[PDB]
Amino acid sequence: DADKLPHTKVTLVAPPQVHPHEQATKSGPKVVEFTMTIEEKKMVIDDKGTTLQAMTFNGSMPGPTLVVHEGDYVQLTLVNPATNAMPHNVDFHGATGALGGAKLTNVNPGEQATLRFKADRSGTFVYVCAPEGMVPWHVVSGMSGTLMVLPRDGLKDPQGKPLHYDRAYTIGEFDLYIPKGPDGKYKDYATLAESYGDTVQVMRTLTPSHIVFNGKVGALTGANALTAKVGETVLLIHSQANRDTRPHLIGGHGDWVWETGKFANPPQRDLETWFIRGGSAGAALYTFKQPGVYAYLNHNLIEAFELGAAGHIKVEGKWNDDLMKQIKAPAPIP
């Protein structure tokens, strides 16, 4: 029975970090308790000062990543404070029944609820807010994240050999649909409700105005680049709740990749570009071998460089001339 089974409480951390946790483990199943608080807020999303009337789980885009093990039970308390204006709920793609939990978590401002479901399938799974009649608006406005359910004995390769990561990072990619006025400038709205009609009309064209990692253009560059060092293995979790994307690590590879995101399937090796289907999360492992700066981006280069879907990873260590060597620097042509 899930009733008896020890309970545990997890504290969440802001993306792109993922909360400390175990890969392989000797512990038996548990009821893992989490809490999240919805926050509607206006956010600045680019270098020219454009804003989005946004909606978030826990104040961030994307929401925090939740980690449990196969066979555990997830038990979430979802809170919607009186300071918000809309109702919300939650749908876990990793769960079975009731539209992922949406039908049992409908919360008006000033209310809360508690849902439990069994995490009986391994992989990275999207969760979203899906209120009847406003599903796409809430999702494109920022209300998505990932639940990672790891196998009890850790990750495995196609032959059943063990795989591991030394660090984990989580990246949410958001296609945004910001309206413009007759002067061709983007519109700035006083409340969340007033942005609605105009936004639906942009959505229907299927052309995003911006496509961003973790809330804004440049969120993962400069002081905020991801970091690693030569010899370390990183797990890159990538979610896209509404639209397809194609991650690529410029200067590196996907060593082992589950593009559909489900760990009971064998991963593919040596990828240059992988593919995340809209409405899913995927995962890639890579072991660094050269120091320097890498670009982790959506490899439709217009979507990356013009629209915003690109970040940086800064890697420390020693250069490997066997792997790569500048034989003759740029010089005049004889």
| Beta-strand pair 91-92/123-128 | antiparallel
Q: Indicate which of Cu ion, Zn ion, a copy of itself, none lies near residue 129 (CB less than 5 to 8 Å, by partner kind).
A: Cu ion
Determine which residue in the list 166, 188, 198, 244 makes contact with Zn ion, applying CB under 5 A: 166
Q: Indicate which of Zn ion, Cu ion, a copy of itself, none lies near residue 216 (CB less than 5 to 8 Å, by partner kind).
A: none
**CB of 243 closer than 8 Å to CB of 212:** no
- Site stretch for Zn ion (CB under 5 A), options 10-18, 28-36, 118-126, 158-166: 158-166
Task: Provide φ and ψ at 284, rounded to 5°.
Answer: -130, 140
Residues 63-102 that bind Zn ion (CB under 5 A): none
Question: How many angstroms separate the CA atoms of 97 and 22, rounded?
Answer: 28
- The answer to whether 233 contacts Zn ion (rule: CB under 5 A) is yes
Task: Provide φ and ψ at 264, rounded to 5°.
Answer: -75, -5
**CB of 145 closer than 8 Å to CB of 62:** yes
Strands of 66-69's sheet, edge to edge? 66-69, 144-150, 123-128, 91-92
CB of 9 to Zn ion, least distance (A): 29
Taking residues 95 to 134 in sequence order and writing x for each that binds Cu ion by CB under 5 A, - otherwise, the string is ----------------------------------x-----
Determine which residue in the list 69, 138, 238, 246 makes contact with Cu ion, applying CB under 5 A: 138
CB of 228 to Zn ion, least distance (A): 11
- The answer to whether 88 contacts Cu ion (rule: CB under 5 A) is yes
- Site stretch for Zn ion (CB under 5 A), options 70-78, 160-168, 200-208, 324-332: 160-168
Is the bond preceding residue 334 a cis peptide, omega within 30 degrees? no
Question: How many angstroms separate the CA atoms of 333 and 147, rounded?
Answer: 55
Residues that bind Cu ion (CB under 5 A): 88, 129, 138, 143
